[PDB]
Every structure is written in structure tokens, then in C-alpha cells.
Design an enzyme around this catalytic site. Sequence first.
Site, mmCIF file in Angstrom:
data_model
loop_
_atom_site.group_PDB
_atom_site.id
_atom_site.type_symbol
_atom_site.label_atom_id
_atom_site.label_comp_id
_atom_site.label_asym_id
_atom_site.label_seq_id
_atom_site.Cartn_x
_atom_site.Cartn_y
_atom_site.Cartn_z
ATOM 1 N N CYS A 168 -27.636 64.942 1.419
ATOM 2 C CA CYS A 168 -26.482 64.078 1.594
ATOM 3 C C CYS A 168 -25.492 64.735 2.558
ATOM 4 C CB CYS A 168 -25.796 63.745 0.281
ATOM 5 S SG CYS A 168 -26.917 62.910 -0.866
ATOM 6 N N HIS B 75 -18.939 61.595 -2.979
ATOM 7 C CA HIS B 75 -19.652 61.896 -4.207
ATOM 8 C C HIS B 75 -19.871 63.409 -4.395
ATOM 9 C CE1 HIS B 75 -23.702 62.465 -2.519
ATOM 10 N NE2 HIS B 75 -23.817 61.198 -2.152
ATOM 11 N N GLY C 294 -30.117 67.679 -1.579
ATOM 12 C CA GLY C 294 -29.144 68.463 -0.863
ATOM 13 C C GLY C 294 -28.915 67.929 0.547
HETATM 14 C C1 LIG Z 1 -26.029 57.655 -6.284
HETATM 15 C C2 LIG Z 1 -26.564 59.024 -6.651
HETATM 16 N N1 LIG Z 1 -26.801 59.866 -5.481
HETATM 17 C C3 LIG Z 1 -25.634 60.530 -4.901
HETATM 18 C C4 LIG Z 1 -25.380 61.879 -5.532
HETATM 19 C C5 LIG Z 1 -28.064 60.034 -4.961
HETATM 20 C C6 LIG Z 1 -29.127 59.261 -5.430
HETATM 21 C C7 LIG Z 1 -30.412 59.495 -4.969
HETATM 22 C C8 LIG Z 1 -30.661 60.490 -4.044
HETATM 23 C C9 LIG Z 1 -29.615 61.266 -3.566
HETATM 24 N N2 LIG Z 1 -29.917 62.192 -2.551
HETATM 25 C C10 LIG Z 1 -30.369 61.916 -1.313
HETATM 26 C C11 LIG Z 1 -30.635 63.118 -0.452
HETATM 27 O O1 LIG Z 1 -30.562 60.770 -0.920
HETATM 28 C C12 LIG Z 1 -28.326 61.032 -4.028
#
Ligand SMILES: CCN(CC)c1cccc(NC(C)=O)c1
Lengths: 306, 306
Positions: free
Chosen positions: A145, A41, A143
Site C-alpha cells: 500500500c 489507513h 506492505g
Molecule cells: C481494506 C483493508 N486493506 C487496507 C489495510 C487492505 C485489504 C487487502 C489488501 C491490502 N493490501 C494490499 C497490498 O492491497 C490492504
Amino acid sequence: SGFRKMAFPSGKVEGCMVQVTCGTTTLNGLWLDDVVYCPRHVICTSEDMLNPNYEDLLIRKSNHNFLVQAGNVQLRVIGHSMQNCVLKLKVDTANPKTPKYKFVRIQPGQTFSVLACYNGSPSGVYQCAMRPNFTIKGSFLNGSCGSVGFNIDYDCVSFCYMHHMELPTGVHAGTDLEGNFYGPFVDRQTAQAAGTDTTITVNVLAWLYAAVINGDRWFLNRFTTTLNDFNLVAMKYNYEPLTQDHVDILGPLSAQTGIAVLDMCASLKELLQNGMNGRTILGSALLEDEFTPFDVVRQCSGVTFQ
Amino acid sequence: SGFRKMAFPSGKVEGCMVQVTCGTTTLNGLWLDDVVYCPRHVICTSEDMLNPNYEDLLIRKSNHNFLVQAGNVQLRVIGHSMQNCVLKLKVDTANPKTPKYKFVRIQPGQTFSVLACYNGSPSGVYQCAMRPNFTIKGSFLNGSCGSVGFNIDYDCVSFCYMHHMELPTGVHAGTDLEGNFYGPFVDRQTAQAAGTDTTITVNVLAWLYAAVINGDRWFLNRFTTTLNDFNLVAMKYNYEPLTQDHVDILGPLSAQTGIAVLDMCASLKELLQNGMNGRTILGSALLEDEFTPFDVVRQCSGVTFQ
Ligand SMILES: CCN(CC)c1cccc(NC(C)=O)c1
Ligand SMILES: CCN(CC)c1cccc(NC(C)=O)c1
Ligand SMILES: CCN(CC)c1cccc(NC(C)=O)c1
Ligand SMILES: CCN(CC)c1cccc(NC(C)=O)c1
């Protein structure tokens, strides 16, 4: 003595964290040998996340669109591929701090350490378990992820988790390092609900053994039970059923405490039925389920298992 | 989101741990620049510990009696001195992995990370607070003396603790890195009792703010109070008195939650008087007091303080 929720020392993993930017999205990667692993992603805009087609989005990406930074050094990307829900970025430089490592897919109930990171920079370490509903209860902000979970055996880091997202209920989902989600989750910004978060019975038992070893004994009762009688109670209180495999790995603790596994189950059953009556165990007012039997045996020196 | 007891990443400290042997006693040292710091009780036999005279015991020690091992490399000791309850061993090699560092003596209520170590090898990391009775509630087994506690600010490790011993009640005592004990304890194998372990009120308040930010709000009540009214209640329940200095450092959390510090005190007062009624806060059934206001603001991104 004493008993604490304890993470693995993080230095081996710290030396593998990098920052990965694609377009305007920045997150963390894991640099092992000449490959950087990160959530796929990274290629999405926030709007793309609503309903991404990753293969299609990837058509418009080249090697030079993935910016990989290790401290100050920029790494040169010479290939990329998608594997399930992770990207693998081939770089021209092997990480000089690569530890001995393996990729493992853990079972629900297993514990591991998370190195929470932002912009490739490690901020904190804590211990997690893989919940029976295949979520973890972490601490993750913008940030983070691509932050990873791991276990260490002597000198070998087993990576078991990469953080991908947060559900609407504030619990966390991610993949193994082959990019397969734990549980039914997908990397899309569409509401996804978790199942029942049941208690990991075998872990609670281990922690009760840890309490006995440390001299917290008030809860030890006069009873025993059977696996079937106990499981009737477990089910009622949303505890995982206990099997003979679970009984087997509690063997060293039974031997140390001289408390038969089934006797400890009978003590647990009474705690479930009567509560703790305002008392604590190992400084907790609830039954802790994020220590495995193997975790306990590491902090209770006088447990013989090897 | 989510909120976890989180240690600092340990890699900067891992690279400083060594093994120190004197006679038949082995424990851990901290190698910074060309000095190794360790507990002075490394010179004692178990019988010496009953009533050691350290100056006298030290007369019979030379540089070559202190064996210092960094992985495989043996370090050459070229000088030694006693500073309070620590030994400083001058070696001929500066540690190449020395981080930027300082020595700080912390106040009761302050939190820090411990890197538990055995034979110079790091085994686990966890977060501790300095209790108001100047003990910590750690996890320490044979050979862990000389394990250190620290905080990290960006790239600078502040060392605040070195482990020396366990009291008969199973709690832990040690020194700053100048060798001065926290509290009244001495490095002798004679029974020593701890005072009242009071709850760190300002930390409980911070953690209540953390719970609100994460959407645990059930305990928010309709009341406010005063510092004097609250303190009358604190004293009864063995809580540290709250001062205006404490109120001051809770300022950012009050501003974020729009919950006045005194309003939060009134909520805490009701929790003390009514208990939790079987409910949890941030997955705890008791009031957690080992997060500082500064700790919270690090895991609650949307708290403005800088
Ligand atoms: C599915 C959307 N995404 C991915 C970009 C998402 C959703 C909620 C939170 C976070 N970020 C963390 C750090 O969990 C990331
Ligand atoms: C028998 C020794 N122990 C625990 C004492 C052990 C051995 C192998 C595997 C696991 N598994 C878990 C989940 O702890 C545990
Ligand atoms: C005062 C005697 N000493 C110092 C040698 C002592 C007493 C109890 C325990 C430990 N060891 C640890 C790891 O705390 C050390
Ligand atoms: C005002 C910002 N914060 C907490 C939000 C802060 C600043 C300086 C010192 C401490 N102190 C402690 C013990 O947390 C805390």
C-alpha cells in the site's frame, strides 16, 4: 522493431519512496518537496479496518506518532492533515531528489507505470491500465500500500495512482494523489464487488495498428464498417463504445498504415466474431487492451504525430 | 496477489547511461567507474557494416574521436580498447552514480530487464528472456544499440546483455558485457537466421505454479507422468527437455501448492495436447515462458524458499 509492454524508467520515482509506520502498521509513502503522501489507513489496526471512523482515529494521533524513514535517515514530522483518503505528513526536510511533477486524475483506459514497493524499497515496475470499472489488475503483496502509479513526459513525473487495497476478487483499488478513489470504492474491510470489466476498444485498435507496423497482418480483412454497426458488435462482446474522439486519436496510425480507422474496426469486428483460430498477434492469443494510441506511437518510430 | 510481468526498478542503471558518438554514428554507452562500455560497431559507417574489419577501422581512431556525453557534461576519453565485440573507453572521471555491479553471462531461459535507451536517455523498461536460440524478443528502434539488460539482487546490478542488432526476422541479438555474442551471431550487416525458438518448459511450469497460487486452477488435471514420458511430448511441441535440475528448482512451488512437479508436468502435457479451449491462465491465452521459478517466488509471498 518489436513491440513490448514497457514501463517508464522508474529512477525518478525510486528517489521519492519512503517507509511510513504508525503504531504497528507499516506501508509506503511518497516524499515530494517537504510532504510525504500515504494512505490514511496507515492509522488503522486490522480490526479498525472493519468499520473505521478516520476522523475519530486521527484525534489520537500526533506528529510524533508517524515514523517516516528514508533509507536510514529518519524524517521529522512537523504537521499532518487528512485529504480525502490520503494523509499528508509535513516534514522538516525537502526531498533533495524531488523530480519535476504534477498530480493528475486519469480516465478509464489510460495506462501508467506502477513501482511496486515494500517498506519504502522499490521491488518492481510494470505497466497498468485504469480499467473501465475503475480497478487495476496489478501485483501487490503485504506492505505494498502507498506504492504509486505514474507517467513521465520528458522530465516531468505525473503521479496518477496510489495503491490502497485489494478486492475479494483479487483486483486492485486506489486513489489519485488528492486521495479520491477511482470508482466507488472505500477504504474499509467490507466486501466490495467490481462492475463489468469491459475491453478498452480504442486501445485494442491502437495495438492492431502496432501489429501491422511490425508486420503481423494476417487479421487484416477486406471489409469496412460504420461507428454504429461496430458499436452494435462492441456492446455484445463487452467492448467500450467507440466515439469520434477515439477515432481522432487513432489518426496518426491510420495515416502510417494507410488503414482507415473504420477499416481497422471492421477487422476487429471479424476477430470478435470468428476468434483468432489459434493464431497470435504480437505474440498474444488474445486482443491486448493495455496500450493507448500514445503508447504505440512511442514504440513505432515511423509513426508521424508531432 | 495478482501476477504481472515485472521489470527491476531501473534507477541504478539510468544513472549509468551515456551517449557515445564516433564520426556520424551515435549510440548508448554504459559508464561504470571510469570505463564506458559500448558496441564496437560505433566505429562503422553504415557501408562499413556490410563487411567490417574492426581492427583495421580502429587504426584510424584516437581517444579524441570518441565523444562521450553524460547529460550535458562531456567526458574526457584517455584510453580505448576493443574487447571482443565491445569497446571500452577509459574516461578521466569515475561515474559518481556507479552502483555495486557484476558482469554475468546468462544461460538460455534466464530472464532480465532491458532499459531501452536513445541518445543516452532511458525511455522504457521491460522484462526479456534469453531464448533457447540465443535471441531476445525486444523492442528496439534507431539509436538503441548499447542499451543493456540486467538483474538486481538487493543492491547489486548484474549486467548480462548489451544490444547490438536486429535480425531480418525482427528479433534481437547482442553480447554479454565482455563483448561475446549470445549464440552464433556476428556484428555484420549480412543476413543471419535464427534457429528454432523452443518454449522454456521450466518457466511454463513455474508460471503454472504462479497461476495455482493466484487461484487459476481449472487446468489442474487428474494425472501424473514421468520425465521421459513428458519429454517425449515436449520434443513434439518444440519444448525444451526437462531435467532433474529443472525439477529441483521447482521444489518450493511444489511444496507450496502441494502439487508434485511431475503432476504439474502431466497437467502441462494435457494443455499441449488439448489446447486451452478458449480459456485463459493469468489473463493469457497462451502458455507464458518468460518467468523463471525465481521470478515467481518473488511475486508469490507465501512461497517458502529461503
Ligand atoms: C481494506 C483493508 N486493506 C487496507 C489495510 C487492505 C485489504 C487487502 C489488501 C491490502 N493490501 C494490499 C497490498 O492491497 C490492504
Ligand atoms: C494523436 C497522437 N496520440 C496517439 C497517436 C495521442 C495524442 C493525445 C492523446 C492521446 N491519448 C491516448 C489515450 O493515447 C493520444
Ligand atoms: C549489423 C547492423 N546493425 C548495427 C549498426 C544494426 C542492424 C539492425 C538494427 C540495428 N539497430 C538496433 C537498434 O537493433 C543495428
Ligand atoms: C529454489 C528457489 N528458486 C526458484 C524457486 C531458484 C533458486 C536458484 C536458482 C533459480 N533459477 C531460476 C532459473 O529461477 C531458482
